[model samples]
Structure formats: structure tokens, C-alpha cells
Target chain A: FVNQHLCGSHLVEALYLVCGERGFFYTPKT
Target chain B: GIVEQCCTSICSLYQLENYCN
Candidate 1:
């Protein structure tokens, strides 16, 4: 359970960072 | 501001939840 939560958190952080920085030509949902 | 300056993976996650929630 600990590892699962940690892994999920890492995934969320990764996804968040991908869209967190930089501006795009078209807005999606940032 | 100070937030973006001090943000890390853990801090990012914490902020993410606040914004998301």
C-alpha cells in the first residue's frame, strides 16, 4: 500500500509537471 | 513568487491537490 500510494503520487507529479510549465498555442485545461 | 521558487516534487504534489480540489 505504501509503495502504491508513493507510485501514484509520482505519476501525478509527472503528469502535473508535463503540463505545468510552458504555454501552448491552444489552451487545453491548464 | 516564493512558491514557484521553492517548489519541489513534494511541494508540487501538495499544491496540485489544493488547486485540483
Candidate 2:
């Protein structure tokens, strides 16, 4: 199993996704 | 990181349990 997906691309594109940035599943308080 | 963050999915399945750590 993958410990974590490595990025040869070092793709920070995931950062665009709120989940990808603030740690997956992040939602702001209302 | 649902415990810390919010939602969940395959890519983020282990998040709270594993990755979130």
C-alpha cells in the first residue's frame, strides 16, 4: 500500500481544492 | 481529517484514520 502518493509533478493543484489544502474535508464554520 | 476538517472520500478515506495524523 502507498504510504502517501508522491508527486513527481509536486502538484500543488490539489491546494486549489479546500479539502486538498486545509486537510481533506475542511469546512468553514457558519 | 473529518475530525479536524469536514468531509470524506476514497482519496481522503484514511484521512481522519491515517492521513489526518
Best by TM-score: 1
lDDT of 1 at B10: 33
Model 1, range A1-30, lDDT digits (tens) per residue?
A: 121222334544544554465411221221
Q: After superposition, how far is residue B16 of candidate 1 from its true place, in Å?
A: 16
Q: Per-residue lDDT tens digits of candidate 2, residues A1-30? A: 223432322212232332353443333322
The segments of candidate 1 whose C-alpha lies over 4 angstroms from its true place after superposition are A1-6, A21-30, B1-21
Give residue A12's lDDT in candidate 2 (0 to 100): 27
Query: Candidate 2: global Cα-lDDT?
Result: 0.31
DockQ-derived CAPRI band for the predicted complex in model 2: incorrect
Q: How well is candidate 2 docked (DockQ)?
A: 0.13
Query: Which pairs of residues clash in candidate 2, taking residues 3 or more apart in a chain or in different chains?
Result: A25-B6, A25-B7
Q: On residues B1-21, what C-alpha lDDT tens digit does candidate 2 reach at each position?
A: 322232222233334333321
Worst 10 residues of 2 chain A by lDDT: A6-15
Per model, the share of native interface contacts recovered reads 0.00, 0.04
lDDT of 2 at A6: 25
Cα-based TM-score, every candidate: 0.26, 0.19
